[PDB]
Amino acid sequence: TCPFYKKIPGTGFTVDAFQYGVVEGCTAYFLTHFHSDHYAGLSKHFTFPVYCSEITGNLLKNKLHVQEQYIHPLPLDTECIVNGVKVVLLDANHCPGAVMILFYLPNGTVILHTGDFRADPSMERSLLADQKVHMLYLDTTYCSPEYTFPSQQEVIRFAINTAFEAVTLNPHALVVCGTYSIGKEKVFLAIADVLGSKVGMSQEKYKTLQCLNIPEINSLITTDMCSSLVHLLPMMQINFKGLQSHLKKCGGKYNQILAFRPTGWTHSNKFTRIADVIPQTKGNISIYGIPYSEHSSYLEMKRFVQWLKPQKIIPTVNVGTWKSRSTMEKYFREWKLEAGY
Ligand code: NI
């Protein structure tokens, strides 16, 4: 059945709740972003109103074939009325089209649902600065102090410098980057920009990227693999067997692969700096795992919450075990006693 942390009290609304059939009492289904664990259940047969960003609405129409009459895209940073209730969509700093949702309840309660997000100090100057938020539905993916990672800018500098040095040493090296969802497009786009190439990819993945409103995208991507020296493959193929196989397909144009796997966190982060990352190598194939995150680190999450000072926190991630729930509640209390709210 639909869990309580997907329901907005005092409304008929749900958030990211498309896999439970008809939720009793729901008049509007919100979708924060186009990742499968959140859209699970949507299709061309859905006949209730879906509220989302413009970019998420492009993906619902083109990838899932949801009918246009049920897609309700909203502009960001704009007060809108939905079924009698004031709402605002804010940029979540996650994947393209991802939003947080502010609900202004008729009784005066204000609720923020973060969806999935990577907290940033820039959020402290959005429309959130303008009123008090009482309840926070929080993306707690990395809510434990072991989870440190570098800035996105530091990680992209590493990737660009590594790829440019390798290809300038060997002009017959191919660069491959893994993907299994939208998000993390800066990794492959930044590397292709430094090398003077388009990114080559499957027709399915090109279609997906063409829904994202990225400026000048026709200049950066292609389905012609032969004209490209940065290829995108499924994340599952980013291993020695998959890569050796791909190299065979390129017909002797290339004699070396340098591959990137943009993971979330990996426990090389508890010890190793970005400067010190090394690949796994077999023969003429090297694979780099780079810690490019689109979720908050522990410290980024803690700063956002201590700034916002909510009266009540409802976690939305890691909620399935009692030890995870109790650990998280302990951190929330620490933060509140340190900051004084
Ligand atoms: Ni997500």
Residue 309 Cα to chain centre, angstroms: 25
Ligand 1 ion: nearby residues, β-carbon < 5 Å: 35, 116
174 & 230 share domain: yes
**Separation of 245 CA from ligand 1 center, angstroms?**
30
CA atoms within 13 A on the CB side of 222: 15
CATH number, residue 156: 3.40.50.12650
CA atoms within 13 A on the CB side of 232: 30
Q: Find the helix or strand (DSSP H, E) in which 174 lies.
A: strand 173-179
Name the strands in the sheet holding 80-82, side by side, starting at the edge strand that comes first in the sequence: 80-82, 85-91, 99-104, 110-113, 135-138, 312-315
Q: Which amino acid type is present at position 149? A: F
183 & 113 share domain: no
Residue with tokens 């989302």: 52
- CA–CA gap between residue 234 and residue 253 (Å, rounded): 21
Angle, helices 152-169/185-195, rounded to nearest 10 degrees: 40
Q: Are 185 and 216 in contact (CB under 8 A)?
A: no
12 & 71 share domain: yes
* End position of a domain, from candidates 278, 295, 312: 295
CATH number, residue 43: 3.60.15.10
Q: Are 136 and 313 in contact (CB under 8 A)?
A: yes
Q: What is the DSSP letter of 180?
A: S
Distances in whole angstroms, Cα of residue 333 to Cα of each of 108, 299, 318, 328, 329: 25, 15, 17, 9, 6
- CA–CA gap between residue 304 and residue 40 (Å, rounded): 29
**Separation of 26 CA from ligand 1 center, angstroms?**
23
Q: Residues 80-87: contacts with CB within 8 Å, 24+ apart? A: 82/13, 82/28, 82/51, 83/11, 83/12, 83/13, 83/27, 83/28, 85/11, 85/13, 87/51
**Separation of 107 CA from ligand 1 center, angstroms?**
31
Distances in whole angstroms, Cα of residue 42 to Cα of each of 39, 47, 115, 120, 180: 6, 10, 17, 30, 19
Domain limits for position 247 = 148-295
The SS3 assignment for 258 reads strand
Spatial CA neighbour of 19 closest among 44, 2, 33: 2
**Separation of 115 CA from ligand 1 center, angstroms?**
8
In sequence order, what are the beta bridge partners of 28? 13
243 & 311 share domain: no
Q: Are 67 and 44 in contact (CB under 8 A)?
A: yes
> Which two structure tokens, joined as six digits, stand for 33?
């972003």
